[PDB]
Design a protein around this ligand. Structure first.
Ligand SMILES: *[C@@H]1O[C@H](CO)[C@@H](O[C@@H]2O[C@H](CO)[C@@H](O[C@@H]3O[C@H](CO)[C@@H](O)[C@H](O[C@H]4O[C@H](CO)[C@@H](O)[C@H](O)[C@@H]4O)[C@@H]3O)[C@H](O)[C@H]2NC(C)=O)[C@H](O)[C@H]1NC(C)=O
Ligand SMILES: *[C@@H]1O[C@H](CO)[C@@H](O[C@@H]2O[C@H](CO)[C@@H](O[C@@H]3O[C@H](CO)[C@@H](O)[C@H](O[C@H]4O[C@H](CO)[C@@H](O)[C@H](O)[C@@H]4O)[C@@H]3O)[C@H](O)[C@H]2NC(C)=O)[C@H](O)[C@H]1NC(C)=O
Ligand SMILES: *[C@@H]1O[C@H](CO)[C@@H](O[C@@H]2O[C@H](CO)[C@@H](O)[C@H](O)[C@H]2NC(C)=O)[C@H](O)[C@H]1NC(C)=O
Ligand SMILES: *[C@@H]1O[C@H](CO)[C@@H](O[C@@H]2O[C@H](CO)[C@@H](O)[C@H](O)[C@H]2NC(C)=O)[C@H](O)[C@H]1NC(C)=O
Ligand SMILES: *[C@@H]1O[C@H](CO)[C@@H](O[C@@H]2O[C@H](CO)[C@@H](O)[C@H](O)[C@H]2NC(C)=O)[C@H](O)[C@H]1NC(C)=O
Ligand SMILES: *[C@@H]1O[C@H](CO)[C@@H](O[C@@H]2O[C@H](CO)[C@@H](O)[C@H](O)[C@H]2NC(C)=O)[C@H](O)[C@H]1NC(C)=O
Ligand SMILES: *[C@@H]1O[C@H](CO)[C@@H](O)[C@H](O)[C@H]1NC(C)=O
Ligand SMILES: *[C@@H]1O[C@H](CO)[C@@H](O)[C@H](O)[C@H]1NC(C)=O
Ligand SMILES: *[C@@H]1O[C@H](CO)[C@@H](O)[C@H](O)[C@H]1NC(C)=O
Ligand SMILES: *[C@@H]1O[C@H](CO)[C@@H](O)[C@H](O)[C@H]1NC(C)=O
Ligand SMILES: *[C@@H]1O[C@H](CO)[C@@H](O)[C@H](O)[C@H]1NC(C)=O
Ligand SMILES: *[C@@H]1O[C@H](CO)[C@@H](O)[C@H](O)[C@H]1NC(C)=O
Ligand SMILES: *[C@@H]1O[C@H](CO)[C@@H](O)[C@H](O)[C@H]1NC(C)=O
Ligand SMILES: *[C@@H]1O[C@H](CO)[C@@H](O)[C@H](O)[C@H]1NC(C)=O
Ligand SMILES: [Ca+2]
Ligand SMILES: [Ca+2]
Ligand SMILES: [Cl-]
Ligand SMILES: [Cl-]
Ligand SMILES: [Zn+2]
Ligand SMILES: [Zn+2]
Ligand SMILES: [Zn+2]
Ligand SMILES: [Zn+2]
Lengths: 686, 686
């Protein structure tokens, strides 16, 4: 028999291990020779594995690299303009790789060049709320200052955006042991903690879903028009550089001015965590000086796209995708996901060589340039948008498979809640103490739902990974699953190696295997069920929760709601109608002829599509999903009813309340209309 | 047998006559009591005729009406501010209707209120080129002046837009006998010519496809947020009023200043056609004074939507629609079309009562508020956009069936060229001298193709009628067909009556019948063919013609093309690929299983959809079709490759040529990309 069990049993922990070792011996930075080589290898192997076609899709996009003969660094300078302390020019390489070439040193991709000098201000995590505190509570003025912020809590690009709007002239990012050093575990190479010389790389763009900064809306092909750098989308306007906590300690130890407003502002360094500005009396005349010399450069990137043509519905696509490019070795991010994808392609190809084909077409993708702003997935989706929006069933992401070894973590559209619950009930738990018990059982025990008894937590999708164009721009149902902790200390550091994984995370590759079963299990059911495995009633349940929540935010302002006649009645009405119509639809779907079948599967496929507004969100044309958008304060986090949420945010500070509440009302109308219109797609068609 | 012949033979000239008389006895102005009454009648009749459901879809939209106790008029005033001539307060009513109530007097819908006085300037048709002449050649300055323009050549809203940008403070529109009086025919009631007291009503909005000015993008439902009037879309900023040629003669006879630059600037009045500004010496101190008191008012409108559910593909919609609202009696516009729609519904209902159902769902629409900016069709399409873009096969418009009695006039997407050629070959010509010969034969003889021997002319779709949202915003294949002359003199006048039609246009209702056969014939084939009756190869042929044409425009500037490296190579490459892929697709479509069938019909249905750019055209978000857009200089006219055309227009006058030609290059990239992406939808799907 060729069924899901056949597929799942073919998957092997030992192959995932072999592929992970194979993908992590040399750096695979986007735009480099070694990453083009790996692309070609994967293309070759996927062909050998049995896919029908495997092609490279290339694009020429804006990337960013340090200057090899002109290193980035930070200084403390004295009053004679003398550099009395310099930050490190590279991370100490891990054992046995001290002779690897082409390790890119730590930098903030897309930083402009510059050498600003000034006085430091410590901004905690540089969240929206942290800047409100500095300015509004502590009356600290960040204008003309260099801010130093610890990584964590929110996407780094949002930190740099927040810093720019507070008027900073430079940002220094560092990893505080409070956030990146787990108590009682040893630093790398002797455990999984971040050593003091380790540094987190990462881009600091604010693209809001545009993809390549020079070609928003259109693929970066051979004949593309490009914007000039000055009109590019998302580029920061102040220099930015990341450092480790040994270097951070040196910069923070002399901080004067105000003390931290509270304990939530102090990390674990032997330092006062004084907010500044400037150093204490003795050192009052010393300044901080940045030296940033990185360059932005149009560079070719390569996605690998494999097709396994469907037997019955070849014009319906289920996509499994994840990126291949890494900052250095990528032992977790992304190769722990790419190895799982490789083993899934291998299994499917094994069923294929024995004569099986899935019902629908499965597309497999190895995306490039994820680390530089989701560039590879975005440009491909821009090129193929018409095919995807009329044919795309679902997108399953496959970045890092593990970020911990405690339990499963799933983030997906409500349409796939039932699918995941059912699949995880048929999978074995890899967990200690749950031998013989289902993955569903261990997961719900270790990660219980905040809302329901006997159910696991499933989170929203935001952004910050390759599903974002498919879900947030195009409205294709999307999901992701990984193993997680109770992100991880070595994130985007040179220490993210094969050895980290094999020694400290998953020696038996059993958690990798579990993730391959969940991702592959999902793809199989999406590509093979006769009725698509979506449950519209689950969307109805969450829409009421999100309506309750946004109403509760507005109701912090009862006087204004009275004055400006702010009613949520339309939105609750729409949610009620959606609930009724989806109940009826689900009755027909079980009570219901292939055209009825094909017509009906289309209602299911286009339901996520119906939450798309073609006009996008305000000033963010590429975020079009009215229910979910990446948080405007944290790209990684999903926000519900984002348009109304952003209209309400800090509304009490707006100068013209009538206009502000008018906009809240406008956003309620758009949300209610969109929920009703989505509901109406599930009505009888004629 | 229930086949097309059965359908076509059921259609009767005598019923079309009975319905036309029934729909034209009283005025049906949008938003009035009488037009709600007619809506309810049609709803009732369509139910009786046999449709499955017939519902009223209502919306509350911005409309415009004169003040009943404060009439609009124009004066000549002397130096004491004395009004020595006044224009008429109403058109003399036709015989037997001098006692009809609620005839709205001539006005320009959406004119602001005001009483500007100043000196007249005569601007010919107020085209873009006419204003270039005044300013650039004749050095005439329109700023602070009242312009007087003759109707014709272009949409009136574009005249008022052109006038505003030239700095005019008022516009007077009038009908010149050169354009509205055919030599040797008698004025109404004794023939079909415009009498000197007749006046053409019409709105002067510049909505660029937005629909209701207060709710662009979203339906004007009960809970809608509305823009304030000051932020409304499309409203003119200067008073505007139309007059007949008796009143025009009085205003033009005293015109001084410069003479007409040439004979193309003189109409048929016994007047110099002097451009001005101001009157000749003797009358130099007299001025023109407008008195405009109309008000804009949110008002309820009602569309009638009838459904005949498809037997096999109920989730595929073929739409026949046309408007019901008229300026006065609507004897041609629109009731000559609504009567044909009514008889088509009657025939289909006759097949239905005998047990037949079409393969796909047919939706029939009686739109409201067409005369006020396509409001009814637009708000309905905004409300149902998700259903229409995933389910809409085709839209056939049905405004006025006759505007002449000489020959057929068809304007449609290239996808329906073959369908119309084939259908018209099976229909009988109603023409004198072509008895026993096909409609195809008379039409190609009287209206030969400019390009091909033995073929008829088929024009492009632009805007100015209810197909515009479906075609230009949503990308649903659309068509229209009518009888035309070798528009018509009584257009939008009180003289457009049943008697006009029955006496002077179509006494036997044979031309109406021919149009009912062509519109109904098209709907039948779209709703009933097993393979949709579209030919992609016809699009390939026109794309090359339009690429040749836009290249030829650019090549008026060879030096700039050299300097700025302006290449059309990408666009011709895309057109070549489209031609090859469409050739291959058409081989498969004839060589090819219902899923193959359903999958294949989807490639055909979504081909028009693929020419949609979700980002729209520059500053015109609701015009999204990259091949066709309404001309920026004439809403009624279709423009090909509008984005590149507008980038090139008057480019030699642009101050920064580098930026200007950069934009031409950008538009070429967008067009080439869109043509390739459309081509790729016809490739094999996997
Ligand atoms: C959820 O689904 C329900 C249908 O199951 C849907 O109900 C609709 O609600 C609207 C109100 O938003 C109703 O609109 C009314 O329609 C009648 C004609 O049928 C009009 O006469 C009404 O207008 C009068 O009353 C208004 C209110 O005071 C006045 O403002 C106005 O001036 C008029 O005097 C009004 O337009 C509609 O009939 C129902 N449809 C039904 C019950 O079938 C509801 O809207 C859905 N929710 C959402 C968010 O879409
Ligand atoms: C019409 O359809 C044809 C396919 O039938 C399609 O042809 C494609 O054209 C592009 C050019 O726009 C080709 O792109 C090349 O791809 C190769 C890899 O296969 C690259 O090596 C090339 O890059 C080099 O050369 C460039 C030109 O000098 C340099 O700019 C660059 O730096 C590199 O040195 C280049 O990207 C593509 O391979 C073909 N595909 C084929 C033949 O299958 C054509 O683009 C279609 N038209 C449109 C408008 O889409
Ligand atoms: C990763 O595995 C690949 C595939 O097995 C290895 O590439 C092959 O290497 C052999 C011997 O060098 C060549 O003859 C083949 O042509 C390669 N196959 C390909 C690229 O498809 C590769 O060497 C491995 N990499 C590491 C670091 O172990
Ligand atoms: C998850 O599994 C449940 C339980 O098997 C499925 O729900 C059942 O579906 C069958 C087939 O329609 C029905 O006859 C049962 O009444 C359902 N049981 C319930 C609702 O308790 C459910 O469809 C599965 N989810 C998927 C496939 O997405
Ligand atoms: C247009 O025709 C309609 C339908 O025949 C006429 O409306 C009917 O009039 C009769 C007699 O007055 C009523 O009893 C019916 O209820 C009406 N039917 C409807 C509205 O469906 C209408 O009178 C005609 N109008 C004119 C001007 O001749
Ligand atoms: C218009 O009629 C022509 C001639 O009948 C149709 O073209 C023929 O289609 C049949 C069925 O596929 C083919 O076998 C012939 O080879 C075609 N004849 C040609 C191309 O000369 C054409 O399909 C009709 N157009 C429609 C239905 O849209
Ligand atoms: C790297 O540094 C210096 C200039 O500061 C020089 O070698 C070269 O121009 C730089 N490379 C760049 C700007 O890409
Ligand atoms: C920091 O580096 C600069 C540039 O190479 C150098 O001049 C300075 O001496 C260094 N300072 C220290 C403390 O090593
Ligand atoms: C913040 O402080 C700087 C000090 O240079 C000042 O120039 C800037 O205007 C201040 N911002 C305001 C207006 O509070
Ligand atoms: C893996 O699980 C065990 C048990 O808690 C633990 O010793 C180890 O720290 C975990 N690894 C990581 C990286 O969390
Ligand atoms: C009509 O005219 C006068 C005011 O000029 C008065 O009867 C009434 O306000 C007007 N109606 C309007 C403004 O709708
Ligand atoms: C024009 O109408 C105005 C306002 O009613 C009136 O005062 C004037 O006398 C009229 N002029 C003529 C020429 O009738
Ligand atoms: C056109 O003429 C008017 C006369 O009042 C003048 O005010 C206006 O500025 C002129 N436009 C220009 C700048 O040519
Ligand atoms: C209808 O056709 C005849 C023949 O040319 C002609 O006498 C009459 O003017 C035509 N009617 C119209 C309105 O063009
Ligand atoms: Ca792009
Ligand atoms: Ca609207
Ligand atoms: Cl993931
Ligand atoms: Cl029409
Ligand atoms: Zn990653
Ligand atoms: Zn990463
Ligand atoms: Zn009309
Ligand atoms: Zn009209």
């Amino acid at each position: 028999k060729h069924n899901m069990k056949a597929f799942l049993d073919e998957l092997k922990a030992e192959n995932i291990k072999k592929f992970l070792y194979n993908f992590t011996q040399i750096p695979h930075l986007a735009g480099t020779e070694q990453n083009f080589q790996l692309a070609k290898q994967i293309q070759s192997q996927w062909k050998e594995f049995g896919l029908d076609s495997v092609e490279l899709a290339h694009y020429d996009v804006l990337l960013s690299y340090p200057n090899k003969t002109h290193p980035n660094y930070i200084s403390i300078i004295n009053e004679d303009g003398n550099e009395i302390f310099n930050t490190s020019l590279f991370e100490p390489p891990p054992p046995g790789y001290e002779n690897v070439s082409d390790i890119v040193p730590p930098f903030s991709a897309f930083s402009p060049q510059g050498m600003p000098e000034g006085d430091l201000v410590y901004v905690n995590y540089a969240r929206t709320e942290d800047f409100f505190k500095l300015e509004r509570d502590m009356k600290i003025n960040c204008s003309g200052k260099i801010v130093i912020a610890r990584y964590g809590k929110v996407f780094r690009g949002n930190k740099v955006k927040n810093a720019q709007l507070a008027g900073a002239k430079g940002v220094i990012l560092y990893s505080d042991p409070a956030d990146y050093f787990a108590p009682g575990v040893k630093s790398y190479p002797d455990g999984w903690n971040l050593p003091g010389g380790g540094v987190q790389r990462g881009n600091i763009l604010n693209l809001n879903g545009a993809g390549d900064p020079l070609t928003p809306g259109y693929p970066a092909n051979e004949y593309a028009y490009r914007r000039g750098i000055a009109e590019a989308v998302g580029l920061p306007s102040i220099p930015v550089h990341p450092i480790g906590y040994y270097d951070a300690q040196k910069l923070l130890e002399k901080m004067g001015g105000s003390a931290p407003p509270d304990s939530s502002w102090r990390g674990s360094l032997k330092v006062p965590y004084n907010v500044g500005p400037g150093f204490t009396g003795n050192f009052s005349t010393q300044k901080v000086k940045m030296h940033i010399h990185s360059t932005n450069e149009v560079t070719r990137i390569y996605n690998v796209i494999g097709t396994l043509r469907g037997a019955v519905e070849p014009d319906r696509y289920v996509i499994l995708g994840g990126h291949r490019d890494s900052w250095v070795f990528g032992g977790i991010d992304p190769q722990s996901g790419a190895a799982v994808v490789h083993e899934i392609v291998r299994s499917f190809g094994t069923l294929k060589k024995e004569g099986w084909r899935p019902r629908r077409t499965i597309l497999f993708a190895s995306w490039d340039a994820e680390e530089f702003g989701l560039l590879g997935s975005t440009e491909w989706a821009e090129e193929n948008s018409r095919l995807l929006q009329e044919r795309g069933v679902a997108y399953i992401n496959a970045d890092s498979s593990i970020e911990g070894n405690y339990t499963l973590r799933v983030d997906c559209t409500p349409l796939m809640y039932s699918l995941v619950h059912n699949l995880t009930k048929e999978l074995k738990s890899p967990d200690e103490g749950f031998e013989g018990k289902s993955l569903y059982e261990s997961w719900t025990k270790k990660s219980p739902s905040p809302e329901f008894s006997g159910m696991p937590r499933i989170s929203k999708l935001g952004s910050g990974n390759d599903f974002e164009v498919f879900f947030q721009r195009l409205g294709i149902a999307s999901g992701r699953a990984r193993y997680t902790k109770n992100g991880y200390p070595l994130y985007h550091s040179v220490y993210e190696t094969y050895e980290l994984v094999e020694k400290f995370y998953d020696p038996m590759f059993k958690y990798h295997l579990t993730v391959a079963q969940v991702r592959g299990g999902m793809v199989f059911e999406l590509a093979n069920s006769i009725v698509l495995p979506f449950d519209c009633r689950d969307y109805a349940v969450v829409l009421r929760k999100y309506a309750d929540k946004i109403y509760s935010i507005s109701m912090k302002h009862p006087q204004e709601m009275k004055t400006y006649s702010v009613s949520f009645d339309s939105l609750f009405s729409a949610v009620k109608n959606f609930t009724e119509i989806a109940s009826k639809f689900s009755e027909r779907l079980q009570d219901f002829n292939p055209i009825v079948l094909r017509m009906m599967n289309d209602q299911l496929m286009f339901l996520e599509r119906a939450f798309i507004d073609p006009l996008g969100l305000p000033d963010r044309p590429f975020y079009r999903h009215v229910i979910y958008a990446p948080s405007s304060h944290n790209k990684y986090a999903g926000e519900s009813f984002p348009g109304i949420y952003d209209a309400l945010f800090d509304i009490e500070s707006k100068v013209d309340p009538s206009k502000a509440w008018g906009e809240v009302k406008r956003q309620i109308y758009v949300a209610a209309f969109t929920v009703q219109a989505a509901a109406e797609t599930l009505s009888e068609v004629a």
